[PDB]
Amino acid sequence: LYFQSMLEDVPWFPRKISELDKCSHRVLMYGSELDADHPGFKDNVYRQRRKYFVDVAMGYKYGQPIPRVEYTEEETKTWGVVFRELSKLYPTHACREYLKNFPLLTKYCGYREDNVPQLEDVSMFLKERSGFTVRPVAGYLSPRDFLAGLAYRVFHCTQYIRHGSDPLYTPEPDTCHELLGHVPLLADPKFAQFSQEIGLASLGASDEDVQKLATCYFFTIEFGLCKQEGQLRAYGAGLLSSIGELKHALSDKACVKAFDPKTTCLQECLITTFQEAYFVSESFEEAKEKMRDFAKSITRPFSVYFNPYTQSIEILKDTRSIENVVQDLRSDLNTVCDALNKMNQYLGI
Numbered sequence: 143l144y145f146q147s148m149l150e151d152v153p154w155f156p157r158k159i160s161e162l163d164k165c166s167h168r169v170l171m172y173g174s175e176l177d178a179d180h181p182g183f184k185d186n187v188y189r190q191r192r193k194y195f196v197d198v199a200m201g202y203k204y205g206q207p208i209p210r211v212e213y214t215e216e217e218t219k220t221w222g223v224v225f226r227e228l229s230k231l232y233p234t235h236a237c238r239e240y241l242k243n244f245p246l247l248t249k250y251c252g253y254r255e256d257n258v259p260q261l262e263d264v265s266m267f268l269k270e271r272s273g274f275t276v277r278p279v280a281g282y283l284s285p286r287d288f289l290a291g292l293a294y295r296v297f298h299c300t301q302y303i304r305h306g307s308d309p310l311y312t313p314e315p316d317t318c319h320e321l322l323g324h325v326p327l328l329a330d331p332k333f334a335q336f337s338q339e340i341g342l343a344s345l346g347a348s349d350e351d352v353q354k355l356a357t358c359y360f361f362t363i364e365f366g367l368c369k370q371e372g373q374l375r376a377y378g379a380g381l382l383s384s385i386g387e388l389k390h391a392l393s394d395k396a397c398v399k400a401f402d403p404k405t406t407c408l409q410e411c412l413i414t415t416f417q418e419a420y421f422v423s424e425s426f427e428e429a430k431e432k433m434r435d436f437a438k439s440i441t442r443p444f445s446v447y448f449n450p451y452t453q454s455i456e457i458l459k460d461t462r463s464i465e466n467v468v469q470d471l472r473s474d475l476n477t478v479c480d481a482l483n484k485m486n487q488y489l490g491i
């Protein structure tokens with residue numbers, strides 16, 4: 143009864159991976175709902191495709207594999223233009239994590255200019271490498287629902303291609319943005335943990351706090367820089383997608399600051415580019431540390447613990463669940479000691 147009353151005071155969140163379906167289908171604005179200033183607003187042929195990707199995404203259910211999508215010649219050509227113009231900047235703008243996983247994506251997921259990668263290939267790739275998976279989404283989800291996905295290391299992705307009239311421009315996150323922006327970093331473990339941190343911190347949180355985490359998501363996952371060996375590199379997906387803002391964030395005429403969760407979450411997210419400032423993290427371990435610490439400030443009666451074996455959320459409400467966690471850590475520390483002893487036994491140190 144005590145636990146029942148505890149959850150009634152906080153917003154609903156999926157406690158099982160199967161319950162995440164409720165978040166995936168709560169689309170506030172479907173992809174077929176083109177904006178008035180959209181370059182394909184009068185394109186009936188384009189609207190037909192946008193409606194097609196919506197229906198495909200709406201048909202997705204947990205456990206079922208992501209259906210293969212036959213992209214048209216125009217859509218592949220549009221992908222090809224984006225793929226080339228961004229590849230000319232990556233070895234000088236993208237972080238080390240990006241350049242390490244991108245060739246792997248070319249090998250296993252078919253990242254080419256003459257072929258649009260399928261989500262099912264990407265999902266199996268990410269799961270095997272960082273535990274992340276992707277889901278097709280029919281449109282825009284609330285920040286609460288999208289972040290809830292990250293708590294399970296599930297990234298909701300679009301499948302549609304931007305309008306072919308201008309491949310170097312997109313008002314919305316098309317599949318080119320997802321595959322070339324988010325995916326190559328999702329394959330990195332330290333980044334995956336960092337992305338999952340934001341998600342776990344949103345579970346059961348207030349709308350005000352969720353909006354803050356969404357802002358932190360914006361100026362990191364979407365528009366973030368990382369200092370690697372003095373040189374400045376972009377890791378934000380929004381930067382790795384826009385060829386113009388990518389070179390700008392690493393230019394001299396751009397205001398560059400450091401990622402401070404309490405201050406950054408108050409910064410204004412500008413959809414109409416560019417951004418007023420770009421925040422920098424030293425690493426994805428520090429970034430994870432920044433969100434691991436920031437979650438303490440968010441008000442909720444409990445703390446959450448992700449169970450990767452059952453893909454569920456453990457609510458730490460009593461001393462029993464807490465003691466259970468500590469005991470597991472004592473077992474893991476024992477394994478650490480064993481490895482230490484075996485190292486002394488063989489390496490003589």
Ligand SMILES: [Fe+3]
Pocket residue numbers: 315319323324364379380
């Ligand atoms: Fe994005």
